[PDB]
Amino acid sequence: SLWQFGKMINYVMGESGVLQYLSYGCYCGLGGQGQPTDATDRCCFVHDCCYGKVTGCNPKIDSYTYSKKNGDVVCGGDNPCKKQICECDRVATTCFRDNKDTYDIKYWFYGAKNCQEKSEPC
């Protein structure tokens, strides 16, 4: 679930992570539009597309199984649909960490109105 995504982001990126990442660029969040602004935003683009591939369960709402130890996240459980959701979230957090060095506060709480151009398709 998005609540668990926020917990993951917190764990991996720090306390300020949820605010820092879940309104960024054109895609960070869900259901974005337009062109990804930078590498971090492409993390959320891929995340969106990832949730788009989940059939059989709800990636926004349903709770998966995960562990957090010594700084990173591992997805578990024996319900493959929920683990697919978890993997979307896990991948996205590692992608945020990998690209932290190009994070630009210009794109923090970037308006929707700044992303009104043709959307890149999944």
- Binding-site residues, in ranges, read 27, 31-32, 48
Residue 80 or residue 116: which is nearer to Ca ion going by CB? 116
Task: Candidates 29-37, 64-72, 73-81, 93-101: pick the segment binding its own copies (CB under 8 A).
Answer: 29-37
Binding mask 44-83 for its own copies (x = CB under 8 A): ----------------xx----------------------
Residues 6+ apart with CB under 8 A from 59: 50, 51, 85, 88
What whole-number distance in Å separates Cα of residue 122 and Cα of residue 117? 15
Paired tokens of 8:
């993951």
3-class secondary structure, 1 = coil
Instruction: Find the binding residues for Ca ion in span 33-92 (CB under 5 A).
Output: 48
